[PDB]
Amino acid sequence: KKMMEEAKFNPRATFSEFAAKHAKDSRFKAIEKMKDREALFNEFVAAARKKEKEDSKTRGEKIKSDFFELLSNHHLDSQSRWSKVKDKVESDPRYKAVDSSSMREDLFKQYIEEKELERQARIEASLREREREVQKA
Amino acid sequence: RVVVSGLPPSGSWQDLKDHMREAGDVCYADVYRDGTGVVEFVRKEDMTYAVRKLDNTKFRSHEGETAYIRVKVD
Amino acid sequence: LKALRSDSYVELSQYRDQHFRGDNEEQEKLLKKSCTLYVGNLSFYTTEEQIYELFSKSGDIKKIIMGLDKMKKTACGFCFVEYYSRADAENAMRYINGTRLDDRIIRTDWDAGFKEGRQYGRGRSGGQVRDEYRQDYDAGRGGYGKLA
Amino acid sequence: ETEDHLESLICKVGEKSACSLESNLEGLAGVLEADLPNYKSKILRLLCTVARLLPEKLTIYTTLVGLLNARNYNFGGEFVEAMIRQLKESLKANNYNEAVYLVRFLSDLVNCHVIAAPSMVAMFENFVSVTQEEDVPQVRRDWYVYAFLSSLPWVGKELYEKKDAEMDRIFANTESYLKRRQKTHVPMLQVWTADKPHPQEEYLDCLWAQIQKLKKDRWQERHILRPYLAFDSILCEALQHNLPPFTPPPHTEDSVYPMPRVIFRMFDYTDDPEGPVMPGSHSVERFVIEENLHCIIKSHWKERKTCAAQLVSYPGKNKIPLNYHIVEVIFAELFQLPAPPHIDVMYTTLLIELCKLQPGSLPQVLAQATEMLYMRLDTMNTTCVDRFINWFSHHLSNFQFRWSWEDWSDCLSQDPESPKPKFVREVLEKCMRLSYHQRILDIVPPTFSALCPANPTCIYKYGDESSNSLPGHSVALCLAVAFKSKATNDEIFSILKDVPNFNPLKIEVFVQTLLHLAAKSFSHSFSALAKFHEVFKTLAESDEGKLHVLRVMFEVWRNHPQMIAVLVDKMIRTQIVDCAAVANWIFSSELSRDFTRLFVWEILHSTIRKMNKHVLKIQKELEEAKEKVLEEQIERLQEKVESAQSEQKNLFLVIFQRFIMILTEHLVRCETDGTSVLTPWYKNCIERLQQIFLQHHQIIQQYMVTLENLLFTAELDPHILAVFQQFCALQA
Ligand SMILES: C[n+]1cn([C@@H]2O[C@H](COP(=O)(O)OP(=O)(O)OP(=O)(O)OC[C@H]3O[C@@H](n4cnc5c(=O)[nH]c(N)nc54)[C@H](O)[C@@H]3O)[C@@H](O)[C@H]2O)c2nc(N)[nH]c(=O)c21
């Protein structure tokens, strides 16, 4: 494991390449059999790759989550324009924390989308009953 | 494409498709030779199933006539 | 020797020769030794000239039979292409099947063999059965399905 | 069952796993040992197979034969025993390409501590020794060197730790041999003759130059993945073996060796500035990368979808511009001198499948390569151009004929005969045949209209001519009447009895009329030929008749090349005309103006193949009938073989005599009017002769006595002889 920490990550490193980098290291020689060196090598990679995935996509959810929290501070509705909001939040560490402009805009577009709702439901139920009656007739 | 054998005398492919559908979905059916027929399913899952489940079953024609049909993968 | 033998494009399809006489066994024996192919999804206006040009890319063609409306006797949207050798038919099956012929994606299938009467749509209305229930719009096959 | 599971697992390792490869090789290693007691023969078989059929996996399996040798010395000794036996077989059977994969598998085993590093060297020393062998074909001396050099990318590094003394004396005899080889074949195998940008090198020179950069780099390449080279945990203490003294099989009259090759090259790192640097042309990484890619296509050519996937997922040790390597290697195969390893149409759809798999990056590269090919057209070999036209036009028809034609505006103001405009004209002609006239006029810009193909309309002579001063005019008018009336042969014969002069005029009025009344479809013209087939066999009972039919048919359909082709084909198959007549027709003065168009040759080669197929067919029948009334047949089948082969030889004889005649005529005229010999016409004509040799070198070989002493003799212009000598160098 130490042998792999002396190189540059290289998760998809071949065993003969890994063996070439760590061949004179004693933590490498300490394991008696080549098969067990390869098995430790294989498992540590697979556990490091497994962990990079699970880590970089809780940072993803954290970048996105932070960006929304930033937006939540401004009074946005379906009207508001990104052209206008941008110049108001562009300093925040949560805005810069999204490495792209195309995507800060998409996240913004997503974030952007009783009596009157009762009347709308009235119109909907009336149209449904009218369609049913027309079918029956 | 699978084949059918042991169909009723007064039966057609149209009525057969109604029995083969039990497998899932049919694409084409036919009944030639005055006894044997044929069918064409969509996917292999529904096909292989037909030859498995829909095998040596009791076909029921719309003319009140029943019989034993044999399905096979062709 | 090993599984490199894989030839999925040449394998038999699920379709069965409709008005064929023999067993499914007799139809299958013909299909695995055939040199003739069924070609589906052509447009009603796809010509024998176009078919000849595309299918000749996999070997020499012996004959091409255009599918017709049993009653109108006009191009139906399918055809039979017959090669002189099965090796050439296999290659059409391998590299022509699933590609464009006259701007539309076509599908080939092994065919037991041409016989008088196989050129006519068995479609209730004269064309191909396939077109009786089509619920999609196709300007190359006369618009919507027959039941529309 | 078990049998089945072994083969399954042996393949799993090579395939893309979901757990580090080394692990799988670890596991399968034991599993296989555990089964050695009962399944020794099978596992011994399976491995020898994957060794000669899965080269693209070379190092994944060598490792495996190592981990095993590292658990059962006696096993490795048995495997290595088979391999040598398996290798001796491939060699005796002339399956040299398969041998190389074996010879190369052994090589890499040395890196897996299975074969004595010194042992390998002793064998190679014997390979190179072939160069000394007296009175043997160069293609033979060539294969052993190639088998040797092509291995070094794998063995070389460690094979240099030892016997450098002889491993220097070998390079010595090689270098010596490499500088003494004749290179007569190069001009005939090059895709382009222009070396201004990137040179198309002879395969051995290119590889020689490749080894060098590796050697002078201390044999340290950075691509070849190595999954069993790590012997510091297991392979180390393994006990290597010694390959028995290998004495290369004696050259016999039944030996057939691979033909020499020229390396197709169109890309360099500057063609992909913003992409991982591309290994150079003289880097072994280039060789190895294209080798594996070529081998992958060879393993999956029958299934296009699986094929694209194995290519796109190719495992490179260090990143490389994969998409570019994939396109380069596919064109390398399509344009392989005369034709590539597999059926032409396979590359077309294979490329389509690759575009569907990498929608975001493959298409641009494919579009970049098309542009580059077009711009280098001026020196591309005619045989490849044809291949280019057919590929591109067929490709376009799958993408609604969408192309940026203005990018090629430069052709618009060039001699119509120049390669670029001609290429466009031919591509468009091809697009029309895959659709229709009007459609093509609609896809290209107004400025290109001039290059569009003529409307494929019939041209009746005695038709709405109203110009009736023509002979047999009325006779033709009666024919038209009869035909439309369901006339019979004898009736038509009668109508024809009233024709004043083998009667040329009768043929013309018959053909002109019969074809005109069936000009609506191919199927009409066919049945037409079939119905009044008896008339044809009469009027054209002579070669002049046969020749005249072709002449009038061409007069009638000169605007519809596809019609002409299918008719000639149909006529030959129904024996209305024979190949000799077709051959004389091709070189006839009536075709002089269309002599360099594609359809002319597409027809000539289609006639030659029918002849060849015919010969082959009858030979087989005799073969089968001989392997059994049954006699009267073999007596007859013998006679038929005779005639068939005789007519076949005559076809090549006439074709060559005609080529010699028109090429000499050109060479003389020029050498008299002090005019340039290198005209567009000349380019097509000389390269068309070369193509005859390329496409049918196998059959032509049977005529060496006649060709070498009677036709292509010294009194012939060197420009013509050159073509012959290049051909002989293919198996020299
Ligand atoms: C499709 N196909 C046709 N031919 C030949 O071409 C001619 C034209 O007749 P059709 O009139 O094209 O004939 P059928 O296929 O006989 O009947 P059918 O099999 O019932 O089946 C299927 C097409 O119709 C559809 N269909 C059939 N019945 C129903 C139904 O009840 N409901 C719905 N919704 N669809 C149905 C279905 O989707 C299907 O794909 C005939 O001479 C055939 O031999 C084929 N030949 C080969 N080798 N391979 C093929 O795949 C093939």
- Chain D residues with CB under 8 Å of A48 CB are none
C82 in Cβ contact with C61 (< 8 Å): yes
Of D19, D29, D230, the CB nearest to A15: D230
Any idea how long chain B is?
74
Instruction: Please write down the long-range contacts of B55-60, taking CB distance under 8 Å and 24 or more positions apart.
Output: B57/B19, B59/B6, B59/B7, B59/B8, B59/B11, B59/B16, B59/B19, B60/B19
Rounded Cα gap, residues D682 and C77, in angstroms:
46
Whose Cα sits closest to atom 12 in ligand 1?
A: C128
Name the closest residue on chain C to residue D10, using Cα atoms.
C2
Question: Helices then strands (H, E): number in chain D?
Answer: 32, 0
Whose Cα sits closest to atom 13 in ligand 1?
A: C122
Q: Which residues of D154-185 are buried (b: 16+ CB within 10 A; e: fewer)?
A: bbbbbbbebbeebbeebbeebeebbeebeebb
SS3 breakdown of chain B: % helix, strand, coil, rounded to 5? 25, 35, 35
Beta sheet of C61-68, edge-to-edge order: C61-68, C75-83, C36-40, C107-110
Rounded Cα gap, residues D73 and D70, in angstroms:
7
- Chain A residues with CB under 8 Å of D154 CB are none
Rounded Cα gap, residues C114 and C132, in angstroms:
23
Q: Which residues of D14-34 are buried (b: 16+ CB within 10 A; e: fewer)?
A: beeeeebbbbbbbbbbeebbe
SS3 breakdown of chain A: % helix, strand, coil, rounded to 5? 70, 0, 30
Chain C closest CA to B29's CA: distance in Å?
7
Give the burial class of C31: count Cβ atoms within 10 A of its Cβ; 0-12 exposed, 13-18 middle, 19 or more buried: buried
Q: Give the DSSP H or E segment for C29.
A: helix C24-31
Whose Cα sits closest to atom 46 in ligand 1?
A: C38
C7/D303 Cβ within 8 A: yes
Local structure of residue D455 (DSSP, 8 states): P
SS3 B27: strand
Q: Count other C-beta atoms under 10 Å from residue D98's C-beta.
A: 19
Question: Smallest Cα–Cα separation from D495: which of D506, D507, D479?
Answer: D479
What does each C-alpha distance from B12 to B15, C18, C26, C95, D219 come to in angstroms? 6, 12, 21, 37, 75
User: DSSP H helical segments within B1-74, as ranges?
Assistant: 13-20, 44-52
Q: Which residues of C129-139 are buried (b: 16+ CB within 10 A; e: fewer)?
A: bbbbebeeebe
Residues 6 or more apart from D562 whose CB is under 8 A from it?
C49, C52, C53, D433, D456, D599
What does each C-alpha distance from D491 to D486, D487, D566 come to in angstroms? 10, 6, 28
Rounded Cα gap, residues D265 and D640, in angstroms:
47
Chain A closest CA to D211's CA: distance in Å?
22
Which amino acid belongs to residue D710? L
Distance C88 CA to ligand 1 centre (A): 25
C2/D433 Cβ within 8 A: no
In units of Å, what resolution does this entry have?
A: 7.8
Q: Which two tokens stand for residue D532?
A: 């009044």
Question: Smallest Cα–Cα separation from D551: which of D571, D574, D534?
Answer: D571
Rounded Cα gap, residues D60 and D244, in angstroms:
25
Q: Count other C-beta atoms under 10 Å from residue D330's C-beta.
A: 24
Three-state SS across A43-107? HHHHHHHHHHHHHHHHHHHHHHHHHHHHHHCCCCCCCCCHHHHHHHHCCCHHHHCCCCHHHHHHH
Rounded Cα gap, residues D269 and D4, in angstroms:
46
Question: Smallest Cα–Cα separation from C49: which of D591, D424, D519?
Answer: D519
User: Which domains are present in chain D?
Assistant: 2-263 (1.25.40.180), 284-453 (1.25.40.180), 464-730 (1.25.40.180)
DSSP string over C109-121: EE-S---TTTTB-
| Residue position matching structure tokens 């050498």 | D671
Distance C130 CA to ligand 1 centre (A): 6
Question: Smallest Cα–Cα separation from D261: which of D40, D100, D43, D478?
Answer: D100
Interface of C with D in 8-37 (CB under 8 A): 8-10
B23 in Cβ contact with B41 (< 8 Å): yes
Kindly report the CA angle at B29 between B23 and B35, in degrees rounded to 5?
105
C24/B32 Cβ within 8 A: no
Rounded Cα gap, residues D657 and D665, in angstroms:
12
Rounded Cα gap, residues D14 and D16, in angstroms:
7
D495: Cα within 13 Å, side-chain hemisphere: 23
Instruction: Please write down the long-range contacts of A56-60, taking CB distance under 8 Å and 24 or more positions apart.
Output: none
Instruction: Please write down the long-range contacts of D91-97, taking CB distance under 8 Å and 24 or more positions apart.
Output: D91/D248, D91/D249, D92/D249, D94/D254, D94/D255, D94/D256, D94/D257, D96/D143, D96/D257, D96/D258, D97/D258
Q: How many CB pairs under 8 A join B and C?
A: 61
Chain A: partners with 3+ C-beta pairs within 8 Å: D
Chain D closest CA to A47's CA: distance in Å?
11
Q: Count other C-beta atoms under 10 Å from residue C17's C-beta.
A: 26
**Exp. method:** cryo-EM
Rounded Cα gap, residues A17 and A24, in angstroms:
13
Of B1, B33, B42, the CB nearest to C16: B1
SS3 A136: helix
Q: Considering only CB atoms, which residues of chain D are within 8 Å of chain C? A: 7, 11, 46, 49-50, 53-54, 299-300, 302-304, 306, 343-346, 348-349, 352, 390, 394, 397-398, 400, 433-436, 521-523, 562, 566, 569, 606, 609-610
Q: Which residues of D687-714 are buried (b: 16+ CB within 10 A; e: fewer)?
A: bbbbbbbbbbeebbeebeeebeeebbee
Kindly report the CA angle at A32 between A30 and A35, in degrees rounded to 5?
120
Q: Which two tokens stand for residue D684?
A: 């097509």
Backbone angles phi, psi at D202, to 5 degrees: -60, 140
Q: Which two tokens stand for residue C65?
A: 């039979």
| Residue position matching structure tokens 């007069």 | D555
Chain C closest CA to B22's CA: distance in Å?
17
The arrangement of secondary structure in C1-121, i.e. its CATH architecture, is 2-Layer Sandwich (3.30)
Backbone angles phi, psi at B44, to 5 degrees: -70, -30
User: DSSP H helical segments within D54-202, as ranges?
Assistant: 58-69, 73-92, 96-109, 117-128, 138-149, 166-178, 186-189
C57/D344 Cβ within 8 A: yes
Which amino acid belongs to residue D539? L
| Residue position matching structure tokens 């899932």 | B24
C2/D523 Cβ within 8 A: no
Residue D192's DSSP bridge partners are D380
| Residue position matching structure tokens 């695995």 | C32
What does each C-alpha distance from D538 to A31, D412, D542, D554 come to in angstroms? 92, 48, 9, 20
Rounded Cα gap, residues D57 and D50, in angstroms:
8
Residues 6 or more apart from D217 whose CB is under 8 A from it?
none
Query: What residues flank ligand 1, with Cβ below 6 Å?
Result: B 17, 27-30, 40; C 15, 17-18, 38, 40, 67, 78, 109, 111, 118, 121-123, 128-130, 133
- Chain A residues with CB under 8 Å of D235 CB are 34
Q: Please tell me if residue C13 touches chain B, with a CB cutoff of 8 Å.
A: yes
Residue D723's DSSP bridge partners are none
Instruction: Pick the atom of ligand 1 nearest to C129's CA.
Output: 11
A19/D230 Cβ within 8 A: yes
Q: Considering only CB atoms, which residues of chain B are within 8 Å of chain C? A: 1-5, 13, 27-28, 30, 32-33, 36, 38-42, 44, 47, 72, 74
To test the ligand 1 pocket, which listed residue (C122, C131, C138, C147) has its Cβ within 8 A of the most ligand atoms?
Answer: C122
Cβ contact B–A (≥3 pairs, < 8 Å): no
C103/D343 Cβ within 8 A: no
Q: Count other C-beta atoms under 10 Å from residue D80's C-beta.
A: 22
Which amino acid belongs to residue C118? R
Chain D closest CA to A120's CA: distance in Å?
45
Distance C72 CA to ligand 1 centre (A): 19
The beta strand positions in C7-90, using DSSP E, are: 36-40, 61-68, 75-83
| Residue position matching structure tokens 């009447």 | D481
Q: Give the DSSP H or E segment for B5.
A: strand B2-5
Whose Cα sits closest to atom 28 in ligand 1?
A: B28
DSSP string over D315-361: --SS---HHHHHHHHHHHHHTSTTS-SS-THHHHHHHHHHHHHSTTT
What does each C-alpha distance from C43 to B28, B38, C79, C141, D571 come to in angstroms? 21, 27, 11, 6, 30
Local structure of residue D308 (DSSP, 8 states): H
Three-state SS across D599-623? HHHHHHHHHHHHHHHHHHHHHHHHH
Residues 6 or more apart from D163 whose CB is under 8 A from it?
D118, D121
Q: Please tell me if residue C93 touches chain D, with a CB cutoff of 8 Å.
A: no
C20/B38 Cβ within 8 A: yes
Residues 6 or more apart from D131 whose CB is under 8 A from it?
D141, D144, D145, D173, D174, D176, D177
Rounded Cα gap, residues D156 and D137, in angstroms:
27
Domain ranges within chain C, ordered by starting residue: 1-121
Name the closest residue on chain A to residue D26, using Cα atoms.
A35
D202 in Cβ contact with D188 (< 8 Å): no
SS3 D516: helix
Distance C40 CA to ligand 1 centre (A): 10
How distant is the alpha carbon of residue D540 from its chain centre? 37
B28 in Cβ contact with C132 (< 8 Å): no
Question: Smallest Cα–Cα separation from D462: which of D480, D485, D483, D489?
Answer: D480
Distance C128 CA to ligand 1 centre (A): 7
Rounded Cα gap, residues D731 and D143, in angstroms:
12
Q: How many CB pairs under 8 A join A and D?
A: 59
DSSP string over D10-46: HHHHHS--SS-HHHHHHHHHHHHHHTTTT-HHHHHHH
- Chain A residues with CB under 8 Å of D314 CB are none
Determine which of C21, C24, C131 to mutate to test the interface with B (most B C-beta atoms within 10 Å): C24
Binding site feature residues of C for mRNA: 15, 38, 107-111, 118-122, 128-129
C13/B30 Cβ within 8 A: no
Kindly report the CA angle at D623 between D620 and D624, in degrees rounded to 5?
90
